[model samples]
Target: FETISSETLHTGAIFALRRDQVRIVTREVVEHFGAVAIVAMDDNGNIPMVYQYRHTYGRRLWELPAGLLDVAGEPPHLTAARELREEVGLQASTWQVLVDLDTAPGFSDESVRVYLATGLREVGRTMGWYPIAEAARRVLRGEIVNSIAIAGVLAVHAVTTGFAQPRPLDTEWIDRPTAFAARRAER
Candidate 1:
């Protein structure tokens, strides 16, 4: 398990600043709750992926619609529903769970449950980002919006709710000290 301290840069953006985590394969039942995500794809035949340009990484990355669990009383699935509608202007007829994930295993104790959604319909406008107006103008003429939020969404989707079951064990290897040494040497 791990713990991380995240900071919000703007009023709404949370920046993962520091992480203190470890790796273990022991079996334990720990009760916890966090946010949920939805990989809601339109019924348009092709898989639709959304992405935001991550200024920190200097790249446009893909992700799914995701949100944090609200207060203890708020339903986690509701958070997923809200994020899907707000981010993509789409709603789901089926909200079947695809997988559950931990966003930052080395940093904090948060679990994100991902859902696969289909039978989407556009009913209203999206509650997109405030900076999106300018971004869209640039996009119309061939520019892109850069944000990690989209990366967060697609990362969760690709691993969790893709064509088949996500490998639940991937997060387990994130903090292997021996593996880290190998990876660092490769770099």
Candidate 2:
């Protein structure tokens, strides 16, 4: 479908609103940058989790080590790795696509690439190493509530227990927000 007319209602540094009319369908779309997160699991069957404050929530949330793809042209895996460094001061020799989520597809084109990083090496880190199963349980208990973090925990559980296989590091991310990346590059 093509837009009949599209109007940008507002644009912020991290998000934008656009009202579009494609045929009889009219909707306000929220545009956001693509992001990457890490399931940085150590051999001890645990992954790092961070407690970062989100202004929207008025409290710190327990979420995976994650970051946005704010830097134009940076690959998703690299973004995940860099975010791991920024959040936990760690890196890994092995990385695979644990999952790719088209988060909020109903109102936004935001996508997040979550990676499974192993062979970890400390870069110089506070967060806690949450066991994969315990992490998933925390999700059910409403503790690990961040969408990406929940997905990371469940996906990592699936992988470790042989219920799923990790996607290759370079797997195609069809829903990546290229427009957002290009827009960011313009700045």
Candidate 3:
């Protein structure tokens, strides 16, 4: 499909609602600054998670520490590290790209890169963080609900159990388009 024209419908601090007229059809899409989701694991094999209230879902859910890639010229790994510090006030000595997730591809261009954070240390507590095993039990009990968090957990679990191989921290993110960043710069 080719976009004939596009117009911004609404603009927000982190995302924008844009309408695009394409050859196939006209569609409204949420243009968002791609984000980073962090899977932080301590030396003792405990992955820290965050519990927060998502306004869109209207419920408090457990998720990995994450934040938008809004910092000017910030790489995904740096964003991941910053998010871990900002959200949970934590730090990691080692990091690697775990997975890239396309969130709401049907109606949005939003994407997320999940990072594996090990050699952890606590700095502060903006939100409560939990252990992976504990979060896993919650997942089984229908507690943890964020898709990013769920996917990150499963992927990390696989890697930890020798079922998957993780990409390097500097893995190229060609798939992660910089549309939102361009828009920000334009303004």
Candidate 4:
């Protein structure tokens, strides 16, 4: 439905809460620049994962190396690569589109693109290495609760078991959030 009006309820460093009139009722939405997560696999079947305390979750969780699309004009793939190096101190020589997701479509425009990264080399930072099987097992056994990371691991697991094929690097990413990125570039 087309919005008749848009109103900002609140603004934060990385997100904004807005309400838009769609004729009958108002719809609430959170505007964010979105994010990228990587499933970086080495030859030994290991993927680097970070353990960090998330304030929102109030606990330390294992998450795939990820970052926001805060940089205006950077492609998601490049953002994924940059985040890999920045968060875990590693870089990948190759990247492929694994999956794209919306965090909460009913209340937010935030989206995430997960990449299947290979040809890895150390750029110097670190995370605990977990084998793909263990990672997937953690997801099923309720050890890993991060949704984005679970998507990444499940995707890689499917690809590993020949259940699905990875998409090409330039695969289309639909429903990605762009409003926040545009606003970021203007400022």
Candidate 5:
């Protein structure tokens, strides 16, 4: 439970591999920059999703437009908007916090904050759009395998269908650990 010492095994462009020596034992830990996933909605109530080839899975998987929390002091909502624009060349007229996800709680500190983006307009970059019901079915049928996408789709579906309520747009992530923020501070 107590970390005795932590050693960095390798540092990469996206994440770092490390090992932590604790009171009970030593274990490999993936130190990572947390990220944001945007559940972008258009005027027709469709969600824009991306199908990207994942090397680890050896197949293209459905995902929301996402990016790392590596933009120094950028807040989560800003990160979400920036990612949506950068990845898909679109922007949102409204943004709100949808859900917070822990990518791998067992070993990695990576987390994702899903944002609900509405009033979308294309600025050249693009992705795919799916109805909320269709996307939910895809998730249930094991088509959308990405954790963040699955969560975002379902969360959006719930809100749209009156199953849940989302937190406010001004929500603050005051407790999440920040690898990127620390790195920026050191620079």
Candidate 6:
């Protein structure tokens, strides 16, 4: 990647169009982390889903309210609960293990945590643009989009359908190795 805009890398703000030059961080092997989904269901049995107008696909889509681990290192359920309240002003009382899956096995070391939410209540909506809506606009317009959100939605399905299961790693690679894989295999 080449630098299109001369700026400080430590600033942490990603720029537009020239996002490719950004030096993204990656881990060597998959790291285990938990996640949760705060599903909003109305008293009439209507599950709350986000409506996003995706520019890339040229259409809008519906998805559950979900997110990654928390900054304070809380459990996946905690993250989901917090995210739901923060984003859509909803809280779920019922939570279940929807599923778990490995992401980008070839390059990145990360596992997607999925959770199901049932009991829900609305606290209040936040001030920021709902991420799903923002992402939708970028997607349906055929604009560049990140795969994280798309994969996240599928993760929810994986959990609900019993497709994802926990498993031991076949070849565990330490974050930083001193020797080559060839030498390690010989041992």
Q: How accurate is candidate 2 locally (lDDT)?
A: 0.87
The lDDT per prediction is 0.47, 0.87, 0.81, 0.88, 0.84, 0.44
Question: Higher lDDT: candidate 1 or 4?
Answer: 4
Decreasing lDDT order of the candidates = 4, 2, 5, 3, 1, 6
TM-scores, in order shown?
A: 0.48, 0.94, 0.89, 0.94, 0.90, 0.44
lDDT tens digits, residue span 42-154, model 1: 45423334566658778864545666554344665677778787878878786666566555564444566666676888768412332323333444444433222333334
- The per-candidate count of clashes, in order, stands at 12, 0, 0, 1, 1, 19
Encode model 2's per-residue lDDT on 141-181: one tens digit a residue. 99988899888899999999999899888799989886545
Q: Candidate 6: misplaced stretches above 4 Å? A: 1-35, 38-45, 51-62, 125-187
Q: Against the true structure, what is every candidate's RMSD?
A: 12.6, 1.6, 2.2, 1.6, 2.2, 12.3
Write model 5 residue lDDT over 1-187, tens digit each, in one string: 6898878887777777778888868888777778889998787779888989889989899899998888777887888888888888889998888988888988787888899988888886236889999999999999898999999999999999988977787787653557534654333
Best by lDDT: 4
Model 1 residue 38 CA deviation (Å) reads 1.2
Best of the two (2, 3) by TM-score: 2
| Residue-level lDDT tens digits of model 3 in 1-187 | 7999999888888778889998968899888888889988787667777778889989888889998888878877887888889887789998888988897889888888999988878797435556666767777777776889888887887787788988887787755857777787445
Query: Clash pairs of candidate 5?
Result: 88-125
Give the runs in model 1 whose Cα sits over 4 Å from its true position.
Answer: 1-33, 55-59, 126-187
- What range of 10 consecutive residues in model 1 has the weakest lDDT sum? 178-187
Report the C-alpha displacement of residue 55, candidate 4, in angstroms: 0.6
